[PDB]
Write a protein that binds this ligand. Structure first.
Ligand SMILES: [Ca+2]
Ligand SMILES: [Ca+2]
Ligand SMILES: [Ca+2]
Ligand SMILES: [Cl-]
Lengths: 345, 336
């Protein structure tokens, strides 16, 4: 009767494929959020832009947001460091002035080179970061500096294609030093716990499309999650997800915010009978062949299969009739490592 | 009859071997001035031009020209020319010296993905940044052929160990999921190209680093002389896996004027060795430049461990006080 969005006093919406499709907002995103009355907080693992800059770009894209609605990993990385370093302690910045400013804001002293004697290194993406900047960081790390990364995402999605992410720049430093950083952003629960503490919200919901950041982060933070299937492998990835990466709910896109949570939950489904046995999970359709009473948002079979697989090397997804067959293939759940498509790329 | 007199040309590693930082290695200048075989100076770095590297050598007191130097940039260029059509566009990550070596083999150096490269070549430049890596990552993902000058994780300097080409390669591997072809040491082509340069029949590699100089030499089918002025120690030589084992060991470049029989890793008259009970145990009984015991110990360990199987390291022990002092000099014993 109520929508899932109405069951929550705030939404932590991931700023990845969940809301952006490169150039434009994702299909249905702006319309859906405009009808949400609860607080909308936009959370990003990107530490390159200030909260205000993120908000301005969101507005440009047709969304409504101010800096107060944006939470970034620059902020959580600064808090992580400030919680274990002394007041005024020096921190070498790899990244933008936005990152440096977040460090300054929590009582620490941002610094740009090894000879300035940093106690720590904080690393976020900047498109002007270069070899010499990394050389300063490598010296600091070798001399025992605490090393915090905003995220370890290998790529940065853009219009041009997939470019090196902060995770790529971390890898260079890992090769140079033999060390790994501590990650302040997702999947660490602090970013989300900080978002919730900002407005003292009591019934928060995580909304995102990445199992290893959004969903794992949510589970780590003890919050429920709505996973949206933005990618071709999202359905498959959900089904085969390890326990800490399992979402509470599964939706197609942000239209799901106005659907009933009971319909969205990963659970057994009335339209699908599942038989688990002999290394396989076999799915059969329930109604008469021309019965449409069980067709709702199209994702009921994914919820069914995920639920059967979660309650226990990997099980094979198999069809027990024509309808299951077509519905499994719609969600690319029938594979021989990749789903066969009509035209190959 | 010295070891240098037994070879057409010497493939001499630069840093750690010829010089260490600001200074030439002990006796290097005099020893090289008296060798009459061809001296090629060989470097895994692709940042500096052959002329720049020669200029540096001159500044330290070694007369050398551009033609006496072999770089990874040159090896990378040759590799590209063997895989690409003439005039093919190659995106450069690294210095203009690298871009020029690519042009020199008839390829077209380029900087952007929009220039539609067929390949990416990667060497270190201290001005390479995110934007440069972004361009190369696009090319690599779209299927461009990817060559790396070297895959060394670090670059040693006056101020410490800084990020090397291998670190920058690691960034692109993470961004793309792809892996480059490696042009420099220990890939043998760098060295087997250097011998072609003069059609030499009996070359010798000289270097300090087991995982580049010596591994490269063995892959190239060339014999090798390890010096101890650089990265690796006598301990490291003893425990070197089969692919990184040198033919000869000496203190420094003065060894080029010693008899090759004296330098060879092999049994020695002065040192009796018993292998067994998890130990190599050494006794004295019966020329020495001081490395005789190391050559004896390495030979025994290598003979006992023919293949790179994950086996228990043999411990090195003394059966008398003479062997104890000599083993301790090279840090070949363990205590608690
Ligand atoms: Ca009602
Ligand atoms: Ca219906
Ligand atoms: Ca060397
Ligand atoms: Cl290089």
């Amino acid at each position: 009767m109520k929508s899932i969005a109405q069951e929550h006093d705030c939404l932590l919406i991931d700023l990845d494929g969940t809301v952006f499709c490169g150039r434009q907002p994702t299909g249905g995103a702006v319309q859906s959020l405009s009808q949400v009355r609860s607080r909308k907080l936009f959370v990003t693992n990107n530490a390159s832009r200030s909260a205000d800059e993120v908000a301005a770009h969101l507005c440009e894209l047709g969304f409504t947001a101010t800096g107060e609605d944006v939470v970034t990993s620059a902020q959580s990385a600064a808090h992580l460091l400030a919680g274990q370093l002394a007041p005024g302690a020096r921190v070498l910045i790899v990244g933008t002035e936005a990152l440096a400013n977040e460090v300054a804001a929590v009582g620490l002293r941002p610094v740009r080179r090894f000879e300035d004697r940093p106690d720590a290194v904080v690393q976020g993406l900047s498109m002007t970061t270069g070899w010499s900047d990394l050389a300063e960081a490598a010296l600091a790390i070798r001399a025992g500096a605490l090393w915090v990364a905003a995220n370890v995402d290998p790529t940065l999605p853009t219009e041009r294609g997939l470019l090196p992410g902060n995770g790529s720049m971390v890898a260079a430093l890992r090769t140079a030093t033999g060390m790994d950083p501590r990650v302040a952003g997702k999947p660490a629960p602090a970013l989300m716990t900080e978002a919730v503490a900002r407005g003292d919200f009591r019934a928060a919901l995580v909304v995102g499309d990445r199992l290893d950041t959004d969903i794992e982060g949510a589970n780590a933070a003890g919050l429920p999650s709505l996973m949206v299937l933005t990618g071709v492998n999202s359905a498959w990835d959900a089904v085969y997800a390890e326990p800490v990466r399992r979402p509470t709910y599964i939706g197609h896109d942000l239209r799901s915010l106005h659907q009933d949570s009971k319909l969205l939950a990963v659970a057994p489904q009335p339209g699908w009978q599942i038989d688990v046995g002999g290394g396989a999970v076999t799915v059969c359709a329930n109604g008469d062949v021309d019965d449409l009473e069980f067709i709702d948002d199209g994702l009921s079979i994914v919820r069914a299969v995920a639920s059967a697989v979660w309650e226990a090397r990997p099980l094979r997804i198999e069809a027990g009739d024509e309808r299951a067959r077509a519905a499994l293939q719609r969600w690319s759940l029938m594979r021989s490592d990749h789903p066969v498509t009509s035209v190959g790329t």
